[PDB]
Ligand binder design. Structure first.
Ligand SMILES: *[C@@H]1O[C@H](CO)[C@@H](O[C@@H]2O[C@H](CO)[C@@H](O)[C@H](O)[C@H]2NC(C)=O)[C@H](O)[C@H]1NC(C)=O
Ligand SMILES: *[C@@H]1O[C@H](CO)[C@@H](O)[C@H](O)[C@H]1NC(C)=O
Ligand SMILES: *[C@@H]1O[C@H](CO)[C@@H](O)[C@H](O)[C@H]1NC(C)=O
Ligand SMILES: *[C@@H]1O[C@H](CO)[C@@H](O)[C@H](O)[C@H]1NC(C)=O
Lengths: 463, 469
């Protein structure tokens, strides 16, 4: 067995660290661009929280129904069969996770060099090297142990909470200072609209990127003590706090200055910090870097547990799913995730790839909701200690359908390319699992490579 | 399962040969991580620094809007400050950064005994109407500059009597008006004031004493360069509006000589660009050049100053029976009771806010660009040689989006004929550059156009934009 030591507090901190990343410091400009008004921009931030809460309730019910590890992928594998499960695993390993890790690391590097060049952009090579350095350090500390990773996650969650509380207090102080000319019902809707189409599709699809990662606690299961009670409790506790933090943070972002100043500045947090503090404003951006450093770990802790559980069932090469005696940690899985994140780094401007990940983690959220709806009728004999009232999957399904249709019309080329990329994994499935009794040249090579990696990394195969 | 077992591994991986390699590989990774971290610091240190912002004032960031006759600005019905209160929305839409209000003190005639600067004319309102305008203007980030010239209803701007009593009452006027809250002052026709250099030094001294963000503007009708520079020998933060740029403009070479010779003479200080102290552009230019000139004044390195009605091309020569010193602003076609029916659809403010091909649309697009980009705000200005009658220059601050403006004042079309080896290597013109807008509609925007074989049309201006290179 790997371990059973993740308590309620550790799981809650995992969820907060996964949710709170680079989204809150990057999204509020974009959501203010397509919405056009402060009120409509805040509408997206306040409704995405409700949608995420509905999805969280559905996932909590589904995860207490099926105790198997590797959530979001075990459910689909069991319900829709091997093919849909393999497609979801392929998309999650190749699209969702490395892109999010690259975006988080690049944000960390860009915001940690802000005081050095606070009038222009830093050199690209230095940013790439800093991001790769922090990725390598964090993958090493993850491969070293699990208790250290949990402790680091807890300290960084505390740090993000403190930084966001400081920002919320600084933004709030203007209620007593009388600086609430913005959000005043007089001005209120300072702007109405400009287009006459569904441009809100790529405002929800860009504002619901700071909400990504709320389902990741389901991946770290078989490592959670008393999953039947602690998982639903953590899911029910984390989401309201995140929504309350994010809405008020956006309120403070729009209260201190004008929408145009977000529409021009590329340092949304830095402008606020330098205006409302003047001197000693160097404290906030470093905290942002600190904040972002709490994200990468929270990803590498769960990503490694996905690619692990995705290799036991034969959907991934047998060289993974490795357990290392003397502090069991999936070492080759962690190396694979770090390398996969690194290869994306050779291609820049992934801030245009937020649409990519945000489309893919809507497709493979509607699919799981559909699986839950199907299993609700097909197998009503399952023991479900925590149950959710119906119409929640239906509401999430209609919202999901609307967002898909309205986001597949605005910019079709990139979405179609991504759909083709996730769909071309079926031949890989057929060549890997569906095709059996291969010539000896395949088995001998596979066994030799597995044994070599085994001897190199000093692991044991759970099987 | 597929791999080896724990016991087999321990028998084969506990012997020397594997414990050394993993320790060697662990050392190699640690050396690489520190080697990458040290390499990043080397690149960061061996990198150029970023230039520092020059701490701009409130009048560096946009144009100013002179209004001469408050009565004629609205016409009938409203002729006081309360009447202007409802029209600040239009000015805010224009993205101007100041308001040079016309004289408001009670002036009866050339009799200086009862001519005082410390009270407002009853026709313009009162103190509570005046002050309410200021804070409402502040809520729209609009600064108010008060004009005070003791004699404006007569032919002499400073009376024919002595200058002792007018100077001391003007000095007392500022002390009252700074306490009131005005953000600047203006004096017109200082050439009628004896030894104007000394008094301007005192007024600049007193006004800047109250605060550092205050302004003082002076107006002259002289166009001689030597006369203009005479007032600036003792003052450094003086905005001088004069007829220097006027009395010419038929050829682009003359304007190029006038602009270039002015800037090096003053040492590239901050200046104000305006064709006249208190009169519109139409009094000096034909109707076909208003679009071109409004492009020049919004990219030259200074603070452009416009009179009211210059964004709509208001002209008193197109409407009979209009005084030259106080034309009535044309809100609609019913604003001029005399000879009704001669006002067309493009001579009204409401008739140009929906057509993206009118002067007001061009004024608002240019105004937004001026107060947005760092190159236009506080960037260096460099002009290079071009073809006959062609005026071209580049704006670039440190590394921001470079701008390229090309103007053809001739009446015949020709090629731009742009050439290299005359610009600093920091912002050398590339082979192709994007186009933002053109004076004459008909061209496309956003496409990278070539500059080697670029062609120009009569009385046309281009506003290109190319990135850092
Ligand atoms: C600019 O203003 C000056 C000063 O008012 C004008 O100078 C006047 O010139 C006429 C013509 O000889 C004289 O009769 C006046 O006595 C001058 N004024 C003074 C105060 O001495 C000058 O003509 C103006 N220039 C333009 C182009 O309008
Ligand atoms: C300007 O003001 C300062 C401050 O008192 C004073 O010392 C100086 O004499 C003044 N100069 C003139 C020309 O009024
Ligand atoms: C401005 O005048 C000075 C003095 O003659 C001269 O050296 C300088 O070249 C002039 N400026 C330009 C741009 O030629
Ligand atoms: C502008 O008004 C003039 C005045 O009659 C008219 O001749 C011209 O056609 C108008 N232009 C447009 C574009 O309507």
């Amino acid at each position: 067995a790997l371990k059973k030591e993740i308590g309620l507090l550790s799981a809650c901190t995992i969820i907060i660290g996964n949710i709170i990343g680079s989204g809150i410091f990057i999204s509020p400009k974009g959501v203010l661009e397509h919405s056009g008004s402060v009120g409509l921009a805040l509408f997206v931030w306040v409704l995405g929280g409700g949608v995420t809460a509905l999805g969280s309730l559905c996932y909590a019910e589904l995860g207490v129904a099926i105790p198997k590890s590797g959530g979001d992928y075990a459910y689909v594998t069991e319900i829709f069969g091997g093919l849909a499960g393999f497609l979801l695993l392929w998309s999650a390993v190749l699209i969702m996770y490395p892109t999010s890790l690259a975006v988080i690391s690049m944000t960390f590097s860009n915001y940690v060099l802000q005081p050095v060049f606070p009038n222009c952009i830093p050199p690209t090579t230095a940013s790439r090297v800093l991001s790769m350095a922090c990725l390598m350090l964090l993958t090493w500390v993850n491969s070293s142990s699990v208790r250290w990773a949990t402790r680091i996650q807890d300290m960084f969650t505390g740090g993000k909470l403190l930084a966001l509380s400081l920002i919320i207090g600084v933004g709030l102080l203007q209620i007593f200072q009388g600086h609430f000319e913005e959000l005043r019902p007089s001005n209120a809707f300072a702007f109405w609209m400009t287009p006459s189409v569904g441009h809100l599709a790529l405002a929800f699809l860009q504002g619901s990127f700071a909400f990504s990662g709320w389902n990741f606690l389901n991946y770290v299961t078989e490592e959670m003590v008393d999953a039947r009670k602690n998982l639903p409790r953590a899911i029910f506790i984390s989401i309201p706090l995140v929504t309350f933090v994010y809405t008020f943070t956006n309120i403070a972002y729009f209260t201190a200055m004008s929408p145009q100043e977000l529409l021009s500045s590329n340092a949304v947090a830095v402008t606020f910090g330098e205006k409302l503090l003047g001197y000693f404003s160097w404290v906030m951006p470093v905290s942002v870097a600190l904040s972002t450093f709490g994200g990468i770990n929270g990803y590498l802790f769960t990503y490694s547990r996905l690619c692990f559980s995705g290799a036991r069932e034969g959907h991934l090469p047998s060289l993974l799913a490795m357990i290392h005696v003397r502090h069991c940690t999936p070492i080759p899985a962690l190396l694979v995730c770090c390398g996969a994140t690194a290869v994306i780094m050779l291609v820049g401007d992934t801030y245009t790839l937020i649409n990519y990940v945000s489309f893919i983690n809507y497709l493979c959220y509607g699919v799981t909701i559909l699986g839950l709806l199907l299993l609700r009728w097909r197998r009503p004999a399952l023991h479900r200690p925590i149950k959710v009232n119906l119409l929640i999957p239906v509401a999430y399904l209609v919202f999901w359908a609307f967002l898909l249709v309205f986001s597949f019309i605005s910019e079709p080329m990139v979405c179609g390319v991504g759909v083709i990329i996730i769909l071309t994994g079926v031949p890989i499935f057929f060549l890997g699992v569906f095709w059996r009794s291969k010539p000896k040249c395949v088995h001998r090579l596979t066994e030799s490579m597995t044994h070599w990696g085994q001897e190199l990394c000093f692991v044991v195969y759970p099987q | 399962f597929t791999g080896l077992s724990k016991e087999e591994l321990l028998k084969v991986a506990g012997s020397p040969g594997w414990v050394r390699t993993r320790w060697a590989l662990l050392l190699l990774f640690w050396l690489g991580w520190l080697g990458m971290l040290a390499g990043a610091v080397v690149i960061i240190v061996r990198a150029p620094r970023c230039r520092e912002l020059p701490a701009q004032k409130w009048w560096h960031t946009g144009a100013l809007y002179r209004i001469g006759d408050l009565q004629a600005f609205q016409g009938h019905g409203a002729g006081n400050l309360a009447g202007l209160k409802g029209r600040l929305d239009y000015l805010s839409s224009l993205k101007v950064k100041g308001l040079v209000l016309g004289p408001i003190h009670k002036n009866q005639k050339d009799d200086v005994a009862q001519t005082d600067l410390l009270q407002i004319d009853p026709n313009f309102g009162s103190k509570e109407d005046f002050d309410s305008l200021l804070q409402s203007a502040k809520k729209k980030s609009i600064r108010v500059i008060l004009d005070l010239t003791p004699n404006y209803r007569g032919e002499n701007s400073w009376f024919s009597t002595q200058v002792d009593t007018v100077a001391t009452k003007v000095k007392d006027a500022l002390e009252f008006w700074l306490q009131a809250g005005v953000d600047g002052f203006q004096v017109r026709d200082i050439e009628n004031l004896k030894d104007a250099s000394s008094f301007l030094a005192e007024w600049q001294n007193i006004t800047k004493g109250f605060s550092e963000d205050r302004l003082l503007i002076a107006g002259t009708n002289s166009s001689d360069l030597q006369q203009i520079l005479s007032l600036l020998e003792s003052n450094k933060d003086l905005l001088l509006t004069s007829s220097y740029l006027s009395d010419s403009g038929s050829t682009g070479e003359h304007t190029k000589s006038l602009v270039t010779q002015y800037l090096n003479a003053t040492g590239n200080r901050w200046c104000s660009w305006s064709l006249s102290q208190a009169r519109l552009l139409t009094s000096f230019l034909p109707a076909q050049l208003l679009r071109l000139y409004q492009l020049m004044l919004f990219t030259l390195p200074g603070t452009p100053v416009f009179s009211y009605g210059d964004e709509i091309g208001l002209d008193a020569a197109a409407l009979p029976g209009q005084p030259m010193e106080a034309p009535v602003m044309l809100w609609d076609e019913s604003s001029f009771p005399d000879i009704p029916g001669a006002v067309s659809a493009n001579m009204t403010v409401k008739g140009q806010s929906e057509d993206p091909g009118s002067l007001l649309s061009l004024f608002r697009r240019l105004s937004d660009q001026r107060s947005k980009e760092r190159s236009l705000l506080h960037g260096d200005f460099h002009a290079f040689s071009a073809g006959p009658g062609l005026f071209s220059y580049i704006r670039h601050w440190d590394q921001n989006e470079r701008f390229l403006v090309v103007l053809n004042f001739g009446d015949v079309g020709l090629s731009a004929g742009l050439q290299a080896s005359d610009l600093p290597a920091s912002a050398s013109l590339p082979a192709k550059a994007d186009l933002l807008l053109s004076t004459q509609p008909g061209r496309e925007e956003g496409s990278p156009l070539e500059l080697e074989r670029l062609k120009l049309e009569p009385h046309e201006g281009l506003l290109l934009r190319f990135p850092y290179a």
